[PDB]
């Protein structure tokens, strides 16, 4: 479990850096465990360099056998206490495509994959897929698939949903609107929540940032990391599993006056591009070896990740979906200002469920 967590966290931060690079002055929000799960499931059916690249890109040794670890992780994530947390894997299969029985069986057993034959009418298939994603995300990820092409014969989706109440909720009567001057012409009124209390906290002098843990009731926490002004690049380039471990071991209980915006953010990413920079290339080319999925020629021509979050006085609600063979869109994100980073972590496994950068202050 610990080794899997290390790999998945290395992936979270490596992916975060690629996202930050490709979307420079922008809010970032994503579920690294969602993406890891989808790719690990896909890897059941990959061979050769296609397979090696996926494993290494995910943070594993090329000869690692990861699937029982993922099975255990996903089973554990799906058994929360005191909060809502669920993740699901779906396979949507055109009736003209024969999947290997081994892939169906392995994905069902190890990834709890739900497999469906979709309709030949692409509008009906789009509704089937989107309705499944809405079901897995309590309606928070809507219209994931916008395009659907009749030649697409396999869609693979991982979804995740989280809703937690703060252990120490904010009193809404202490929330106060502050004028946030986004640019020289634009002012945004931000509701700023506040509370005084004793929280696990650390000032990281080396990375020039403040680290605060906000626990949920039940088995998760949010870790908030506020870089000093001008310290963001150095912080981002220093994010590693070891840094996270350092932070967690270094937190001590301190009296603090906490100001946190009430906010909502979304991220939508073209994953094909991002994953290529982590070395996952063959998967996205006609030469891909996905012969463990089907005998038919298959490769991944498009992939999306979509994630949404709401933080308020009561707690946090977040959801995400990773769609293999779904076209990404590029909606507006973050005009731009000083930011903070955050992680939503599950307690038992240490899994990074979600990570963000909010050009909030």
Max Cα–Cα distance, the chain, nearest Å: 62
Task: Report how far residue 258's alpha carbon sits from residue 271's, in angstroms, rounded to the nearest whole number.
Answer: 35
What 3 state SS string does 176-227 have?
Answer: EEEEEECCCCCEEEEEEEEEEEEEEEEEECCCCEEEEEEEECCCEEEEEEEE
* Residues in a beta bridge with 203: 210
CATH of the domain at 226: 2.30.39.10
Q: Are 109 and 162 contained in the same domain?
A: yes
User: Do 134 and 77 share a domain, yes or no?
Assistant: yes
Task: Give me the number of domains the chain comprises.
Answer: 2
Asked whether residue 115 falls in the same domain as residue 224, the answer is no
Residues 307, 317 within the same domain: no
Number of other residues whose CB lies within 10 A of the CB of residue 19: 21
Q: How far is the CA of 347 from the CAs of 137, 188, 353, in angstroms?
A: 21, 35, 11
| Cβ-proximal residues to 302 (8 Å cutoff; 6+ apart), any chain | 270, 272, 325, 326, 327, 328
CATH code for position 138: 3.30.497.10
Helix orientation angle between 67-77 and 2-22, rounded to the nearest 10 degrees: 80
Q: Residue 7 belongs to what domain range?
A: 1-166+262-312
Q: Report the structure determination method.
A: X-ray
Q: How many CB atoms lie within 10 A of CB 310?
A: 17
Nearest to 87 by CA among 357, 356, 351, 273: 351
Q: Is 91 helix (H, G, I), strand (E, B) or coil?
A: strand
End-to-end CA distance of the chain: 34
Q: Do residues 165 and 344 make contact, with C-beta atoms less than 8 angstroms apart?
A: no
Both 147 and 292 in a single domain? yes
Burial of 255 per CB tally in 10 Å (0-12, 13-18, 19+): exposed
Same domain, 339 and 296: no
């Amino acid at each position: 479990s610990h080794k899997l967590a290390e790999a998945n966290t290395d992936f979270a931060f490596s992916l975060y850096r690629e996202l930050a690079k490709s979307s420079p002055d922008k809010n970032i929000f994503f579920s690294p465990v969602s993406i890891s799960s989808a790719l690990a499931m896909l890897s059941l059916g990959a061979k050769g360099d296609t397979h090696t690249q996926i494993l290494e890109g995910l943070g594993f040794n090329s000869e690692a056998d990861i699937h029982q670890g993922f099975q255990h992780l996903l089973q554990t994530l799906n058994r929360p206490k005191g909060l809502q947390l669920k993740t699901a894997n779906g396979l949507f299969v055109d009736k003209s495509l024969k999947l290997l029985d081994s892939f169906l069986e392995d994905s069902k057993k190890l990834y709890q994959a739900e497999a469906f034959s979709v309709d030949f009418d692409p509008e009906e298939a789009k509704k089937q897929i989107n309705d499944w994603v809405e079901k897995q995300t309590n309606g928070k990820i809507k219209d994931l698939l916008k395009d659907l092409d009749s030649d697409t014969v396999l869609v693979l989706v991982n979804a995740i949903y989280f809703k937690g109440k703060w252990k120490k909720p904010f009193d809404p009567e202490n929330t106060k609107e502050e004028d946030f001057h986004v640019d020289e012409k634009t002012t945004v009124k931000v509701p700023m929540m506040s509370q005084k209390g004793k929280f696990y906290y650390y000032h990281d002098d080396e990375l020039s940032c403040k680290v605060l843990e906000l626990p949920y009731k039940g088995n998760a926490s949010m870790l908030i990391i506020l870089p000093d002004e001008g310290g963001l690049q150095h912080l981002e380039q220093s994010l590693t599993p070891e840094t996270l471990s350092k932070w967690l071991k270094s937190l001590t209980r301190r009296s603090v006056e906490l100001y946190l915006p009430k906010f909502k953010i979304e991220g939508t990413y073209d994953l094909k591009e991002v994953l290529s920079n982590l070395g996952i290339t063959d998967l996205f080319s006609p030469g891909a070896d996905l012969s463990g999925i089907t005998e038919e020629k298959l490769y991944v021509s498009k992939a999306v990740h979509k994630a949404v979050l709401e933080v308020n006085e009561e707690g946090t609600e977040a959801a995400a979906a990773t769609g293999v063979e779904i076209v990404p869109r590029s909606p507006p994100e973050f005009k731009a200002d000083r930011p903070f980073l955050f992680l939503i972590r599950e307690n038992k496994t240490g899994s990074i469920l979600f990570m963000g950068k909010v050009v909030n202050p």
